[PDB]
Amino acid sequence: AWTPLEPKLITRLADTVRTKGLRSPITMAEVEALMSSPLLPHDVTNLMRVILGPAPYALWMDAWGVQLQTVIAAATRDPRHPANGQGRGERTNLNRLKGLADGMVGNPQGQAALLRPGELVAITASALQAFREVARLAE
Amino acid sequence: PWADIMQGPSESFVDFANRLIKAVEGSDLPPSARAPVIIDCFRQKSQPDIQQLIRTAPSTLTTPGEIIKYVLDRQKTA
Amino acid sequence: AWTPLEPKLITRLADTVRTKGLRSPITMAEVEALMSSPLLPHDVTNLMRVILGPAPYALWMDAWGVQLQTVIAAATRDPRHPANGQGRGERTNLNRLKGLADGMVGNPQGQAALLRPGELVAITASALQAFREVARLAEPWADIMQGPSESFVDFANRLIKAVEGSDLPPSARAPVIIDCFRQKSQPDIQQLIRTAPSTLTTPGEIIKYVLDRQKTA
Amino acid sequence: AWTPLEPKLITRLADTVRTKGLRSPITMAEVEALMSSPLLPHDVTNLMRVILGPAPYALWMDAWGVQLQTVIAAATRDPRHPANGQGRGERTNLNRLKGLADGMVGNPQGQAALLRPGELVAITASALQAFREVARLAE
Amino acid sequence: PWADIMQGPSESFVDFANRLIKAVEGSDLPPSARAPVIIDCFRQKSQPDIQQLIRTAPSTLTTPGEIIKYVLDRQKTA
Amino acid sequence: PWADIMQGPSESFVDFANRLIKAVEGSDLPPSARAPVIIDCFRQKSQPDIQQLIRTAPSTLTTPGEIIKYVLDRQKTA
Amino acid sequence: AWTPLEPKLITRLADTVRTKGLRSPITMAEVEALMSSPLLPHDVTNLMRVILGPAPYALWMDAWGVQLQTVIAAATRDPRHPANGQGRGERTNLNRLKGLADGMVGNPQGQAALLRPGELVAITASALQAFREVARLAEPWADIMQGPSESFVDFANRLIKAVEGSDLPPSARAPVIIDCFRQKSQPDIQQLIRTAPSTLTTPGEIIKYVLDRQKTA
Amino acid sequence: PWADIMQGPSESFVDFANRLIKAVEGSDLPPSARAPVIIDCFRQKSQPDIQQLIRTAPSTLTTPGEIIKYVLDRQKTA
Amino acid sequence: AWTPLEPKLITRLADTVRTKGLRSPITMAEVEALMSSPLLPHDVTNLMRVILGPAPYALWMDAWGVQLQTVIAAATRDPRHPANGQGRGERTNLNRLKGLADGMVGNPQGQAALLRPGELVAITASALQAFREVARLAE
Amino acid sequence: AWTPLEPKLITRLADTVRTKGLRSPITMAEVEALMSSPLLPHDVTNLMRVILGPAPYALWMDAWGVQLQTVIAAATRDPRHPANGQGRGERTNLNRLKGLADGMVGNPQGQAALLRPGELVAITASALQAFREVARLAE
């Protein structure tokens, strides 16, 4: 069952990003805090939509896609990925990682249903690395 | 109005990009027409130094984020 | 039986030569078109009288005579010329080629009667080569610069025109055009070509690249 | 038997390109008109030599080569090309498409002799697409 | 009038030759007197650069066409 | 000191590269840290024309020799 | 047995490179001189370390590697390379060419022991071509004009230098030099070349003619 | 003295040739050395207009009479 | 028997050439007058030596040689020249025309002995034409 | 076996030409010194490439060609040339003199193999005369 993040925590994090900036160690610590439980693509996408401005959000979408593509290359380079399965029918496509696959587009409940925990942690680590890249790039 | 937005002579590029993306996304365009419009407004607005910087891009930039990253990398520090 | 060329086609060709000039590829194509069927000396002479001015016509008469003389030298060097015959009584004199022989002076019907088809095609090829010579003669690449306000396609057109219509060998035009694109073509485009992540090894590729990445203004 | 295009039509088309430009819809309609019957490489080459200036002609040669190469890749990807045959001895090389093969260089009669109708229509479509590309590029 | 034709300071040589041959052939001279007159008008008109170019001709030019060819070959490109 | 080396406004690039490589190799750095330092000093020193020339490199340059070759090819002749 | 090159010759060559530069014909002649006997990778490597600065040495290492890789591609494309053998056990790896193979690293004696004469001459030719590339790279003909006060021999020297030290094919230099003599070389010499009763078909002949008939001033 | 004879700025060429041939033939030179001296004095004296006129002779002039004829033909009428 | 021309007439002709020039019709008439009887090469040579300056005399020697060469070409083109004979032993060489043949060099008496009247009139006409050429050339 | 000239002597001669000029008697003496042994076309060509500037080198190539052509005319005028042989198969073409013949282009060893000593001395004398002409012409 999907539970959304508190809008109070999200508002506090957005104001933190607004006053301290993207690169302050306190901001990265707060992001790591709100990045503790494995989030669904819907959660991370809406979170970055709210806390980041338009141009940093575009940059972050780009960087997140690139990092997810590196993850999928490593996944096709190793059939023992915690997102993959043993047979070929469990291979994870980027539509399933970005939340674009069938039964997931716009629906967080179905998303949480079909996604694997390894998928969730890989998406989360990818999003964190992308946030770091964009923060280092913006300023 | 998005089609009246120009990058001022003294304005930085991230401020211009913020203003333009704001005015384009908060407008009456369909959702599937915002990215091409933002790109083509980056190319024709954004005073001729950045215009030539985007024109002479050895790679093809097909996303506002990629254009912003490229311009921020190769911009004239001043 | 002799049939004259249409004065309508001749008028259109004359106006083409008047507006486009003698050396344009469209003009040479039109001349090749009106040079399709083997013409009698009368036809080619009147055609050049009408389409060419007085001084180009004098030059063309000179060049036509020289080329016909080369043809007659090759003919006396080979008794199997399509204008010649097997015996010595069919040897073709320049009076017969220029239409000056007996029974031909001023009369196109008699001309068409006595002339051979090989004679006609040789006269026609000679006249075409003479026209080419005079056109190349009647009308500098290393002095061409791209003006401050000129576009790049106009500069490329002018440069390629002046380089291909010059005295360079055919195998030296592309490298010269490239190296002139690189050193002329004012420093904005110079730096645009210099910072090319790919290696451009053809004038067409350079033109395409510059047209893609040019500063819209 | 090869029949050349009328120099009157070619002169009218050249003046159309001279006054209206390369990209006007009337110019493209006129080109489509003179591109009605399948032309031999000699015909299209001389046509573009006459109607186009030197630099657009260089660009058009480049684009025509690229499009013909795409056609030959599709041809080696499908042995049922109307230019190809069933056996391997009918495979069509770029020397045969550009008119550079043996018995064709400079001779339009021999060209018309050895070429296939599928070859002719493929060459013609390739030349039309190349003209469109160059027209979109020049202005 | 043929005897009043001069090559202008800015005029090219083929235009001057065209004008002169036109005025000489469309005049009251006998047919056997046109070529010598055209030659001697090329030599005395046709401003002193081309005058000296024709004067210092290592070969003898005995026809208007030959003079035109020689001058077109050795003319000062400008 | 290697970290104080700048390319002068009038200095050529091969002289700057010679001076920088000399000061970096004749210093207290480990041998495995000289190439990355030389590259990152080419990128941040070497006044902004060459900085932008290296930044807009369609290929990725991963060696001081490759950077030197690229810059020598595409440098602004002056 | 390995014999080192004289440090006196190496010092003289280094000072030659220091004063004349990398691209002078005297410098290339001196390098060809010291490149006469087939050198071991150790010799050429130390030679380029001594005569070249740090940045040209890096460039030269790059170019030498690329040329050796082309050589090894040609070697795997032909089993009859003078560096190769007939069986597969004599195939020459780049570690053996660059001196990195086993029993060769840092030891010139062992190097000279295991290397083939074909290997040595291939390495030497590769190093010479790499030196040529780097020299052409370390340091525009269509922009050269004869100054109002400049003499003609200086202009000809500058133009021939810039044309021969450029990217043109070898068969396109003479026509370009001639056509640049004709269109550059301010209008007095332009008219002097134009009114040439003879046809000049060589840069040397044009230079001789102009030097004969030039306006002494 | 023959070696001191120059063609004056206003003097015609036939007067200069007369004076020079007179002074050369009425001197102490051997008879077999007069023609080469007269030729080489025509070439080096005879102020630079005629000097260049003789220099650019498509034919080789090997006699004082031939040089005189050539110069009289192609001289600048003034 | 050879009789020399009067030095009084030669002095008057020289002063005429000195005052009127080479091209005046009175000068040409006077030359035609002193060119009435067929002169020997010695006579014409000395006459031109006296009346002409050094440079016109060189030009006249050249022109006289050229005209005599044309005459000798016409003579070898027709064996019925009044200077020639019927057999090949009477063919007239340029040494006999210019007075350079054997028994003639410097001796006017021997000259008058061996020369033919046709030879004399041909030499005279040649000299007159050469004088005309040089006069037209000098001014 | 071919032995190259010392680059030290060539450098000294080049500096002599640079300071004293082309026409000084000391320079001509030095050239005669380095022109002592019969040189192959490769040697003389590279020597003139190094010691002479670009424009004097062009002039020297022209003059050397002209002098070699005069030599070949004298050779076809006398079958007893030290470069020629007795039969017609040893006649020396300009491709063999300028080093352009087969087996000689760019290879000094093969050059030294096929060339005759008479060929070498004729080439050397021709090059010396050409150097004299160019030196008299340059200044």
Author numbering:
A (entry chain H), D (entry chain C), I (entry chain J), J (entry chain F): 10 to 148
B (entry chain G), E (entry chain A), F (entry chain D), H (entry chain I): 152 to 229
C (entry chain B), G (entry chain E): 10 to 148, 152 to 229
Copy out sentences from the published article reporting this entry, exactly as the authors wrote them.
Most important, we determined the structure of the mature CA pentamer in these polyhedrons to define the interactions between hexameric and pentameric RSV CA assembly states. In order to classify hexamer and/or pentamer (unit) pairs according to their geometrical context, we grouped them using two criteria that we found to influence the geometry of the mature CA lattice: (1) the presence and location of one or more pentamers in the vicinity of a hexamer, and (2) the orientation of a pair of hexamers with respect to the local curvature. According to these criteria all hexamer and/or pentamer pairs were classified into different classes belonging to six general groups. For further analysis, we rigid-body fitted individual CA domains into the EM density maps of hexamer/pentamer unit pairs. Pentamers, on the other hand, organize rigid vertices, where the lattice is curved in different directions. The hexamers that are adjacent to pentamers are deformed to allow bridging of the tube-like areas and the pentamer vertices. Specifically, the two CA monomers facing a pentamer adopt an arrangement similar to those two CA monomers in the pentamer, causing an increased spatial separation between the CANTD’s of the hexamer. State A was found in all dimer interfaces involving pentamers (with higher curvature) and low curvature hexamer–hexamer interfaces, whereas state B was found only in hexamer–hexamer interfaces with high curvature. In contrast to the pliability of the RSV CA hexamer, the CA pentamer represents a rigid building block that acts as the local organization center that defines hexamer shape and, depending on the position on the lattice, overall core architecture.
